[PDB]
């Protein structure tokens, strides 16, 4: 198949040949043509539109290979990289038992505006009801789902061929692995309801191993407009979970601290949880421990906004609600700076400000303690990224001192 792929120029008539005399020939006409008559799926009336005489002879070639060698998986990423591209293009392109059906069922320009309405652009039922019932003035429902599937079998055989290449890598680069993952996302986006009647049952059997280079892409496609898909896609997350929790662990408590972006979140920490709770708890607690780690700042930054806005309400809101906000370093800094509000009081019916920003200023010009801003020890919670590691390393102690490095945006 290569080596025909590579001489297409000179080999673009032995196929055509070998595709006429197959419904009605050098040496390597009537060879393939024996290995195609082998016997041991694909049908010409598919291909019959959009689809290139002598690149039927490459699609034949790779189901032979892959029916015949079940076992390798470079024959069915082959098939589906095939049958993916031509599906696309075909998809892209068009955007005898039929008119039987339905002149039996509708018992000359009416039948044939009929006809060519049925698959003019195929609430798409509502459209295409709504057209019908214009131009001809219910076997059209029927007739509109068997046409639509009729030209859209490609994919049925990419997506069962890329979900057997993943069934056996549970062999390959990880390349090919992560390009089928994104196809078949891509294809479970796209068209979802087309296909349903495949991802339904192919992501209830799938490993966990292959689709371990994709969550970010799976939990960013958590608000389709849709209901099924968003189950299905929830289920093989806290899948995943299990056996393997150090990948969804920190994104999930995360994302949980439109409802749809909600319960999903919801049910895979519930998930998660049923098996170490107290490290749910513990990965929790240093998340908000970290969040409320990042007060003299805010306040410092704050007077520097207000001055520099000064030259009203605004200023006394903003105020307000940063003493409300702020009520080991927040008892200290709170004895120390507790006649701010009272200041801000006074003033408010200016020399305050400039004096605390000024302090603020000074006292800015590094070594802080953990203890001062919470010290765990002998913990089971994961790193914060372990996508390379085979063994998960625990998380042992924190260390008790804290730098800040200069000229920079403040990092700790």
Same mark, same amino acid.
């Given at each position: ?17 070998? *595709? ?39 699609? /034949? ?135 349903? /009647?495949?991802? $339904? ?8 191993? @292959? ?14 407009? $849709? ?81 520099? *806005? ?95 490095? @200069? ?6």
């Amino acid at each position: 198949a290569k080596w025909i792929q590579a001489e297409w120029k000179e080999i673009s008539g032995q196929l055509k040949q070998v *595709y006429r005399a197959q419904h009605q020939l050098s040496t390597l006409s009537k060879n393939i043509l024996t290995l195609i008559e082998l016997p041991s799926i694909e049908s010409e009336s598919t291909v019959h539109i959009g689809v290139g005489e002598p690149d039927f002879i490459l699609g /034949q070639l790779y189901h032979l290979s892959s029916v015949q060698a079940p076992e390798v998986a470079k024959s069915w990423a082959a098939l589906a990289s095939w049958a993916y591209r031509w599906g696309r293009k075909v998809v892209d392109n068009a955007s005898x038992x039929x008119x039987x059906x339905x002149x039996x069922x509708x018992x000359x320009x009416x039948x044939x505006x009929x006809x060519x309405x049925x698959x003019x652009x195929x609430x798409x039922x509502x459209x295409x009801x709504x057209x019908x019932x214009x131009x001809x003035x219910e076997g059209v429902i029927k007739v509109w789902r068997k046409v639509v599937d009729r030209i859209f079998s490609l994919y049925k055989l990419s997506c069962s061929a890329y979900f057997t290449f993943l069934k056996l890598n549970a062999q390959s680069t990880d390349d090919m692995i992560v390009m089928a993952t994104l196809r078949l996302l891509r294809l479970l986006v796209k068209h979802a309801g087309e296909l349903r /009647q495949y991802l $339904e049952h192919g992501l209830e059997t799938t490993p966990t191993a @292959p689709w371990r280079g994709i969550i970010p892409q799976l939990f960013s496609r958590l608000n389709h407009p $849709e209901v099924y898909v968003r189950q299905s896609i929830c289920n093989l997350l806290c899948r995943v979970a299990q056996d393997s929790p150090h990948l969804i662990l920190y994104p999930a408590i995360v994302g949980t601290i439109q409802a749809m972006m909600q319960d999903c979140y919801s049910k895979i920490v519930d998930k998660l949880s049923s098996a170490n709770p107290t490290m749910v708890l513990q990965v929790q607690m240093l998340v908000a421990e970290l969040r409320r780690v990042t007060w003299d700042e805010l306040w410092l930054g704050v007077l520097l906004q207000q001055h520099m *806005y000064v030259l009203x309400x605004x200023x006394x809101x903003x105020x307000x609600x940063x003493x409300x906000x702020x009520x080991p370093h927040e008892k200290w800094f709170q004895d120390n700076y507790g006649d701010a509000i009272e200041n801000a009081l006074e003033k408010l019916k200016x020399x305050x400000x400039x004096x605390x920003x000024x302090x603020x200023x000074x006292x800015x010009x590094y070594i802080l303690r953990l203890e001062e801003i919470a010290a765990m020890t002998n913990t089971e919670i994961a790193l914060p990224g372990e996508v390379s590691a085979r063994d998960t390393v625990t998380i042992h102690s924190v260390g008790g001192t804290i730098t800040i490095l @200069p000229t920079k945006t403040k990092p700790k």
